Amino acid sequence: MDPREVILCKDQDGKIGLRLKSIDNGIFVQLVQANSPASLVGLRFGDQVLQINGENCAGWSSDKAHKVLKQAFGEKITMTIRDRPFERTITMHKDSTGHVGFIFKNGKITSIVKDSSAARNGLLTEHNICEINGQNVIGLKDSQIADILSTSGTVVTITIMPAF
């Protein structure tokens, strides 16, 4: 529940493989580039950035947050992170036809099927799917997500976050 510190090194262009977004006067991770320093320290879509090099991110724009990272002195950058504060987990069971009972598009839940496991569990729409049975699905094509769900056993555990 408490914030963790990460330490990362910037590449030649002052980059760490991170895009950030301003939400509700906080700063949140929006895109993590594959095999970047940011990926290595476990930063993920939805993680909140409290500080960059000890400076509070509160009220910063995303443009400002990126400028701070790019202009930071030295190679090493420290950030203080609160792990995905908006994340929740829902476990569903496939019915006799192998369905859990939702429709999604672009990795976002758009409808809940009547009287399904998703309905019983109170799955919400306008929520991004983050993980399915321990498989990160951020950045995957809908077909691969549908395939993960298809090959899943009966128990389907998803982590979701409001689309915010």
Partner: peptide
């Protein structure tokens, strides 16, 4: 294109 699951 959407996916009912």
């Amino acid at each position: 294109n959407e996916y009912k699951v």
